Amino acid sequence: ARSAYSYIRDAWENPGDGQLAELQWQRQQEWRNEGAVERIERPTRLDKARSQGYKAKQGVIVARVSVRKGSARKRRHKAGRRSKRQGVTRITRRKDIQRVAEERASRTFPNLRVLNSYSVGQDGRQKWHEVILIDPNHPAIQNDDDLSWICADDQADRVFRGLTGAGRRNRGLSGKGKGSEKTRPSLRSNGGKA
Amino acid sequence: TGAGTPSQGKKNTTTHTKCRRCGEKSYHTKKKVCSSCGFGKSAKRRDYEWQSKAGE
Amino acid sequence: GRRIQGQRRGRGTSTFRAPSHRYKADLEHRKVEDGDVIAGTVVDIEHDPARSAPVAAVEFEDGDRRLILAPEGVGVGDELQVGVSAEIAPGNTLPLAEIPEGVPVCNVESSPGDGGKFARASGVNAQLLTHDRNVAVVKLPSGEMKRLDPQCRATIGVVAGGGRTDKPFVKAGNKHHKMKARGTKWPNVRGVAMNAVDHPFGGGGRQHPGKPKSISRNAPPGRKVGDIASKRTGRGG
Amino acid sequence: MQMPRRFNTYCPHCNEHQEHEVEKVRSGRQTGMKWIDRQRERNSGIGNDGKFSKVPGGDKPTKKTDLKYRCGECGKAHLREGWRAGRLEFQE
RNA sequence: GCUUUACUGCAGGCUGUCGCUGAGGACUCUCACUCCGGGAGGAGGACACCGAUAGCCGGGCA
RNA sequence: ACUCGUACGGUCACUGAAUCCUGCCCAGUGCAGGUAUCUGAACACCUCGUACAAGAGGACGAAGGACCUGUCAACGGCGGG
RNA sequence: AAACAUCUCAGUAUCGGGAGGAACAGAAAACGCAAUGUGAUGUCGUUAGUAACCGCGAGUGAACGCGAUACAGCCCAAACC
Ligand SMILES: [Cl-]
Ligand SMILES: [Cl-]
Ligand SMILES: [Cl-]
Ligand SMILES: [Cl-]
Ligand SMILES: [K+]
Ligand SMILES: [Mg+2]
Ligand SMILES: [Mg+2]
Ligand SMILES: [Mg+2]
Ligand SMILES: [Mg+2]
Ligand SMILES: [Mg+2]
Ligand SMILES: [Mg+2]
Ligand SMILES: [Mg+2]
Ligand SMILES: [Mg+2]
Ligand SMILES: [Mg+2]
Ligand SMILES: [Mg+2]
Ligand SMILES: [Mg+2]
Ligand SMILES: [Mg+2]
Ligand SMILES: [Mg+2]
Ligand SMILES: [Mg+2]
Ligand SMILES: [Mg+2]
Ligand SMILES: [Mg+2]
Ligand SMILES: [Mg+2]
Ligand code: NA
Ligand code: NA
Ligand code: NA
Ligand code: NA
Ligand code: NA
Ligand code: NA
Ligand code: NA
Ligand code: NA
Ligand SMILES: [Sr+2]
Ligand SMILES: [Sr+2]
Ligand SMILES: [Sr+2]
Ligand SMILES: [Sr+2]
Ligand SMILES: [Sr+2]
Ligand SMILES: [Sr+2]
Ligand SMILES: [Sr+2]
Ligand SMILES: [Sr+2]
Ligand SMILES: [Sr+2]
Ligand SMILES: [Sr+2]
Ligand SMILES: [Sr+2]
Ligand SMILES: [Sr+2]
Ligand SMILES: [Sr+2]
Ligand SMILES: [Sr+2]
Ligand SMILES: [Sr+2]
Ligand SMILES: [Sr+2]
Numbered sequence: 191a192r193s194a195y196s197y198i199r200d201a202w203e204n205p206g207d208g209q210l211a212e213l214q215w216q217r218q219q220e221w222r223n224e225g226a227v228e229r230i231e232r233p234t235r236l237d238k239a240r241s242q243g244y245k246a247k248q249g250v251i252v253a254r255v256s257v258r259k260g261s262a263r264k265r266r267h268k269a270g271r272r273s274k275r276q277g278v279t280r281i282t283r284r285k286d287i288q289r290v291a292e293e294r295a296s297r298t299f300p301n302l303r304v305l306n307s308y309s310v311g312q313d314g315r316q317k318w319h320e321v322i323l324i325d326p327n328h329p330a331i332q333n334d335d336d337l338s339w340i341c342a343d344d345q346a347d348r349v350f351r352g353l354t355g356a357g358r359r360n361r362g363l364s365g366k367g368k369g370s371e372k373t374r375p376s377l378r379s380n381g382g383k384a
Numbered sequence: 385t386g387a388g389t390p391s392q393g394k395k396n397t398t399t400h401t402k403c404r405r406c407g408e409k410s411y412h413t414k415k416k417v418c419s420s421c422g423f424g425k426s427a428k429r430r431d432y433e434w435q436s437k438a439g440e
Numbered sequence: 441g442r443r444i445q446g447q448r449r450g451r452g453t454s455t456f457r458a459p460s461h462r463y464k465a466d467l468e469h470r471k472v473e474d475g476d477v478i479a480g481t482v483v484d485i486e487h488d489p490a491r492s493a494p495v496a497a498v499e500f501e502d503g504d505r506r507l508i509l510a511p512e513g514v515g516v517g518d519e520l521q522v523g524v525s526a527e528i529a530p531g532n533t534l535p536l537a538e539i540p541e542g543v544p545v546c547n548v549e550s551s552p553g554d555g556g557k558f559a560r561a562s563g564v565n566a567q568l569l570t571h572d573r574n575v576a577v578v579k580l581p582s583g584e585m586k587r588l589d590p591q592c593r594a595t596i597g598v599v600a601g602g603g604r605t606d607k608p609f610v611k612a613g614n615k616h617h618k619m620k621a622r623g624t625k626w627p628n629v630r631g632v633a634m635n636a637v638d639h640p641f642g643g644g645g646r647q648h649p650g651k652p653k654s655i656s657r658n659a660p661p662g663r664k665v666g667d668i669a670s671k672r673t674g675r676g677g
Numbered sequence: 678m679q680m681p682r683r684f685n686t687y688c689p690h691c692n693e694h695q696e697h698e699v700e701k702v703r704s705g706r707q708t709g710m711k712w713i714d715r716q717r718e719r720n721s722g723i724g725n726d727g728k729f730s731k732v733p734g735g736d737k738p739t740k741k742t743d744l745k746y747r748c749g750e751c752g753k754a755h756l757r758e759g760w761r762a763g764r765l766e767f768q769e
Numbered sequence: 770g771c772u773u774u775a776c777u778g779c780a781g782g783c784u785g786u787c788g789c790u791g792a793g794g795a796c797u798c799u800c801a802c803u804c805c806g807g808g809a810g811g812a813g814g815a816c817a818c819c820g821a822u823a824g825c826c827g828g829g830c831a
Numbered sequence: 832a833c834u835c836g837u838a839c840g841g842u843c844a845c846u847g848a849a850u851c852c853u854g855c856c857c858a859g860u861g862c863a864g865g866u867a868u869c870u871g872a873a874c875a876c877c878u879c880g881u882a883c884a885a886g887a888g889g890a891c892g893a894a895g896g897a898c899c900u901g902u903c904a905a906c907g908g909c910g911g912g
Numbered sequence: 913a914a915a916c917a918u919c920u921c922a923g924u925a926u927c928g929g930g931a932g933g934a935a936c937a938g939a940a941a942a943c944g945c946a947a948u949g950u951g952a953u954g955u956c957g958u959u960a961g962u963a964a965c966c967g968c969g970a971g972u973g974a975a976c977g978c979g980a981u982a983c984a985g986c987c988c989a990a991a992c993c
Contacts (some may be wrong), residue, residue, distance in 0.1 A: 193991045241989045273724030273778045314789025314808045375937035382923040452832030468836035550804040605839040652906040654862035658782040662829035672902040749989025
């Protein structure tokens, strides 16, 4: 039979219809009055969080982060540039907003490590994502068969090096064949042409 | 009044001093910032790749 | 070229800032719950550095000492009232709705409770014309008919210090002293007198703006100089 | 100059002399789907667009004849070198 | 370095459109959103701000 | 920032104390206003095309321009016969 | 590029953040010597200055495969409890 979770999932396929639509209209009013990174005791999208590795356990944290919508907030050149390098308006950054969200969340909790994150909507001027963070120092996690892997030293500050699921996607690592000639094993090893 | 010798006599202000963190006489006592190691500006130590030839 | 003076202003460096640390207070109306049960006694008359006009120090019943934007005719000892039921007399503050049509008012609020925005300069005054349950009509000093919420508070009488502008400065030194009390860079070097690099009008053998002065509203800063979006110029016609 | 609308001449198709009708070549309409069209959209962006920022060249004082010669019996046309002519009017 | 109706572009301003954005070629409303208010509450209101894009101007800048 | 500021303000420019004065010109250029009609992009819409799409065309048309008006203490001009 | 705007120099110099002893990658929604075929991923040799790009100018420039090195494959979400 269908899991209760499937229902949360199905509601979020069309956040603009049904009860969910009404919920968002209500919630966002409060979110707009909240800070940049708000820790929350429970994921707004349980199914999604559990699917990404979330667990109701000690050392598991969830935080919502909001980021301004739009392209790059860039300053026009103050020195000589050929027409090609004078652009300012239509230039966009290479990291998607979800990634910027994961990094701000991780800065807020220096001791925690980003596990994954997912979207929870947006209005006209900002986007919200919830980020799952894990405490690599808590024994309840050090003893977890599904999460202890994130306790290894080489996982420290994983988000800042693009090791996140959103990080790997944004780096063009999804495809294993055609089109990934310059993304794998890293953007840098491939001269930064990916 | 020339910008040269005559203007040099007006110089009796103490700015750069012995830095507590690095020991160089680069701690600007007015700005409270060391121009050599960055003390007062950053926890990290002031450093730049242009301080040496590019391939070295 | 280089940024023009108008652009240096925006950065708000000392050269362009007002001597705020020397200013006294912001003559905003008092806030009363309701009833008008607020009256104070004019304890003194002072000079307001930011406006070159006099200000009245008042001591209210509830024990609050605050400077007020004084109209002409207020003196020490006098008693002032602030509230809906305030008596209709010079120096008193109350919502337009309570003021009788045809009465000169000053320090008029733009939005009920903001403290006063209009007609605060020397010897000026707004003229309350039409009354209503939805809109109070006031003729501002510029001659413009302004539509305000009848709830906007105001003070009866014209602002003190009228006629200040009738006497010429006569000398640069006098202008100097006044300018030193404002957020203004003075004296003024003409654009035509500068180098091309410094202003749209700079350059050329003899001084002259090698271009029409009437500039478009859409012009970017650095270029918007001279006669901004003029509907006309000169005295003719 | 004057030009007869029809006249006998060699038809490279029938491979023999037959009556032909002369017509000025009318410009065919573009589709906007040629490779060059796609290259312009791909290579134009912020700033100068190289060849795609260039504008139409000039004109020669006189243009060369640009006609179609259609065989009155097989319906097929053939082209020929053109010759400079200030004006070209057909007779009949 | 400087100039301009040199070439080519870039900011910036104006303007349409899409998203924010709701209810009943002109209209009403309130619930988002904005503003005033210490507060209650008042004003405004699906506009404005903001994100995107399109046309015009654009030696202010390269 | 201006601004503890509010048109007797403060921003942008020109001329340069007082005194006597400051003519004619709105065609070009600039600014501003208006504008039946003309022109004027994208999205949505419509037709053709494509089992879809590319694409071609249409209808609607904002600012802007055409056009009209105002303005020279606005750029400037006041000749030859 | 014998000027120069796309292109080039070059994702180079330089800047911000971050981990380790090495990093990163990694058990196919792959490949497509099209097959009755290969079988995670780096890297090395080659494929090759080939395909592809480009005021189709100057210039830029892979991949599959193959020969090697080393080899290793697993854990969740959900269903049912
Ligand atoms: Cl992390
Ligand atoms: Cl003054
Ligand atoms: Cl012809
Ligand atoms: Cl194979
Ligand atoms: K270059
Ligand atoms: Mg298990
Ligand atoms: Mg590597
Ligand atoms: Mg005040
Ligand atoms: Mg001063
Ligand atoms: Mg001057
Ligand atoms: Mg000079
Ligand atoms: Mg200039
Ligand atoms: Mg002059
Ligand atoms: Mg506010
Ligand atoms: Mg230039
Ligand atoms: Mg002069
Ligand atoms: Mg002089
Ligand atoms: Mg060259
Ligand atoms: Mg390049
Ligand atoms: Mg060449
Ligand atoms: Mg390259
Ligand atoms: Mg391949
Ligand atoms: Na962290
Ligand atoms: Na790429
Ligand atoms: Na391209
Ligand atoms: Na020079
Ligand atoms: Na004229
Ligand atoms: Na050369
Ligand atoms: Na050169
Ligand atoms: Na090229
Ligand atoms: Sr760290
Ligand atoms: Sr001197
Ligand atoms: Sr001397
Ligand atoms: Sr000294
Ligand atoms: Sr500091
Ligand atoms: Sr450094
Ligand atoms: Sr105020
Ligand atoms: Sr106030
Ligand atoms: Sr000049
Ligand atoms: Sr006149
Ligand atoms: Sr492109
Ligand atoms: Sr372009
Ligand atoms: Sr010619
Ligand atoms: Sr005079
Ligand atoms: Sr005119
Ligand atoms: Sr193997």
